[PDB]
Nucleic acid binder design. Structure first.
Ligand code: CA
Ligand code: MG
Ligand code: MG
Length: 430
DNA sequence: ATTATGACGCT
DNA sequence: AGCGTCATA
């Protein structure tokens, strides 16, 4: 009843760049613009592995993780841009720097949480209050929401896409109560107006387009964002949740795409998020633990409390390289050469980070994989990170791992290593 | 032989 | 601490 919380206390958005690495390359090389194209890393093995795909290329069935040689079978005219290689390895600097461009623009509108290289959550609650004041009871024009979809509309008593969008938008705005400064639906709508503005600024100042979700929490915002891509934004209201979830596979919700989601489906014998409402909170906690159970009980009702954390910078800086199949490292000289290559890239990024962001990493984590282990990581050991010096870091990394060498011979390494990873962590102010 | 990342949970 | 899960380009 009147004491039942409804998770409508915040306005949260999730902004996510469209085919991000592709846009970065298309900005740089106008010949790639408005083409089926993809970004690939390496080239020798099957033409390289695809890591990003333009929407034009997606239409041919080209996807992430496809080998370029195979993508070309689906899309013969597919254009490719290659990730830079430095020190024998893929170097992602260009995309990290482009990400900083976008994050800095977003930060002008609101506090953001960097969620990945190309997405951020935004807490718009305060910005919406402010805007509502300027608005002075004044209605919101559809003109202010030129790329917004309202999930669930139109409904009730045209055959084109933009026409449908506008019909739904009209129904939404027609039903809005603008004299109520605490109406959650109104708050969301003003949130969407601001996100249009944010998205316009990103595109004007970088050339990059993005999509966005606006709702009352991060999970719904994230879900909303993916509903209409590319170059569009979607508002998911509290009221839209029961219908939206009634046919929403559990795996589509953030954090349920893996083993836990599979267990929810298996144990409960359900398929869709909305089906969760029929279980008590204790029932869910009994299956999935106290934390997950409470989370599931609220989430299937559209409610979630995880805050947008004030964090624009990554918490770790790492460098890693796989050495698959035949290329596995089998000599000490090999292992040491590559630890050095990694350590040199890490030093470069750490030094730039110290200058830009006034902080220093204090721990170095070293991880490897050995030929034969199904797990991505085989062994992870940390040591002190006291100086930004590549030779020192690589010498230290070798020290902490050198006893993983089964080989009775000093010069030989066995079993061969199929992955090396150096990660700087535990930052302190400087 | 997707690879190169990055955040957070468990014990 | 070291390991596991889930996620994104
Ligand atoms: Ca994206
Ligand atoms: Mg993304
Ligand atoms: Mg993606």
């Amino acid at each position: 009843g009147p004491h039942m919380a409804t998770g409508q206390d915040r306005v949260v958005a999730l902004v996510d760049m469209d085919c991000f690495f592709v846009q970065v390359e298309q900005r740089q090389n106008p010949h790639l613009r408005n083409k089926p194209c993809a970004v690939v890393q390496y080239k020798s093995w099957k033409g390289g592995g695809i890591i990003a795909v333009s929407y034009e290329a997606r239409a041919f069935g080209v996807t992430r993780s496809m080998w370029a040689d195979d993508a070309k079978k689906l899309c013969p005219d597919l254009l490719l841009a290659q990730v830079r290689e430095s020190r024998g390895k893929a170097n992602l600097t260009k995309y990290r720097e482009a990400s900083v461009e976008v994050m800095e623009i977003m930060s002008r509108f609101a506090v953001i949480e960097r969620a990945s290289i190309d997405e951020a959550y935004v807490d718009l609650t305060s910005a919406v209050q402010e805007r509502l004041q300027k608005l002075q009871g004044q209605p919101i024009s559809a003109d202010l929401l030129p790329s917004t979809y309202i999930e669930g509309l139109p409904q009730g008593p045209t055959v084109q896409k933009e026409g449908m969008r506008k019909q739904g938008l009209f129904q939404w705005l027609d039903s809005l109560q603008i004299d109520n400064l605490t109406s959650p639906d109104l708050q969301l709508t003003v949130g969407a107006v601001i996100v249009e503005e944010m998205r316009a600024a990103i595109e004007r100042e970088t050339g990059f387009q993005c999509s966005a979700g606006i709702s009352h929490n991060k999970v719904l915002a994230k879900l909303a964002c993916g509903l209409n891509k590319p170059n569009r934004q979607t508002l998911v209201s509290h009221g839209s949740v029961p219908q939206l979830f009634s046919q929403m596979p559990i795996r589509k919700i953030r954090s349920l795409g893996g083993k836990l989601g599979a267990s929810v489906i298996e144990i409960l014998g359900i398929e869709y998020m909305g089906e969760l409402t029929q279980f008590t909170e204790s029932q869910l906690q009994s299956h999935f633990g106290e934390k997950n159970g409470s989370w599931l009980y609220a989430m299937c009702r559209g409610i979630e409390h995880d805050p947008v954390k004030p964090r624009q910078l990554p918490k770790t800086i790492g460098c890693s390289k796989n050495f698959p199949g035949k290329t596995a490292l089998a000599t000490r000289e090999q292992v040491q050469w590559w630890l050095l290559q990694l350590a040199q890239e890490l030093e470069e990024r750490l030094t730039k980070d110290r200058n830009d962001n006034d902080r220093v990493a204090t721990q170095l984590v070293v991880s490897i994989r050995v030929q034969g282990d199904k797990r991505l990581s085989s062994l992870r050991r940390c040591c002190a990170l006291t100086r930004y010096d590549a030779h020192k870091m690589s010498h230290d990394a070798f020290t902490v791992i050198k006893n993983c060498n089964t080989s009775g011979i000093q010069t030989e390494w066995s079993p061969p290593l199929t992955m090396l990873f150096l990660c700087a962590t535990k930052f302190s102010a400087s």
